[PDB]
């Protein structure tokens, strides 16, 4: 079923984006005075922070490219999670039809 493949595909893709985002953030932030997003372990925690849109404020980019990377993370995360919500709807809508005969 498409909605399930998509969900899954969306999860593997998000994990890729997170990892690539941790890498790209450090590359972008290092070199900028006062920057804090400069070691991979925390950067990875930051990407998870961003994609889930929780945004604590303990870490965030300050360079143009860092922020640009941050926007791809947010958007991939929002889109990905929004797709799970959508696939859960197709499951419910499908099951609610069965329960009515159709």
């Amino acid at each position: 079923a498409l909605h399930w493949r998509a969900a899954g595909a969306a999860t593997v893709l998000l994990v890729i984006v997170l990892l690539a985002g941790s890498y790209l953030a450090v590359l972008a932030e290092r070199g900028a005075p006062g920057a804090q997003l400069i070691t991979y372990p925390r950067a990875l925690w930051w990407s998870v922070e961003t994609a889930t849109t929780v945004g604590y404020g303990d870490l965030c980019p300050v360079t143009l490219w860092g922020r640009l990377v941050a926007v791809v993370v947010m958007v991939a995360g929002i889109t990905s999670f929004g797709l799970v919500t959508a696939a859960l709807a197709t499951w419910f809508v499908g099951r609610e039809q069965e329960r009515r005969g159709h």
Partner: antibody
Amino acid sequence: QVQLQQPGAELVKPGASVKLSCKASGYTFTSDWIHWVKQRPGHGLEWIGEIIPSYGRANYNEKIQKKATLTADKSSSTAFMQLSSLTSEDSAVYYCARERGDGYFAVWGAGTTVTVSS
Amino acid sequence: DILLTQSPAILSVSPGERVSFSCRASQSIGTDIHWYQQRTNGSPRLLIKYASESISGIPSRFSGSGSGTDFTLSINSVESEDIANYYCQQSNRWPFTFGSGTKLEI
């Protein structure tokens, strides 16, 4: 085994330029950064800059005059520091170190003693 | 850019005694401080990372503690092999910076 190998010494004439090397062995990750640290006799450690080999980007210390230019050779696992127009101020021991992107210098090289004399 | 203050610059202690090295940051940096040892003629060698984490191949004698702006490197029961220069290094904010150093003396 010796993770970072550096030449023992380099002699340079005021104004001339030298190119120091740092050969790495052992585990190498795409998340590695090579650092260069300058130490004058009797004094402390001074960070010069860093290079991310797997990508090739370099950042430098903004407070001190920029006399360095970092490059790296992915194939031979060698990091290079290009010092130009050296003066007596630039004579010192230059160490290279490897950081795994977690902020601390895991291993340092024996360091190359540079001397700027005529 | 973060300034790491190391004072006193020299520390005199007697054999077997406990010694403590101080390192203060000009702003809060969590536990992003690392300690290096450097003997006469040798290159620096990581002693403690992240203010208090052990490194393999280093006498259980060495420990560290602190968080925020005040950090300590302690040697329980000093001994001649420990005579050297000690530096702290921070990785909280770019660029990484080093302390001016503290010389140990028996």
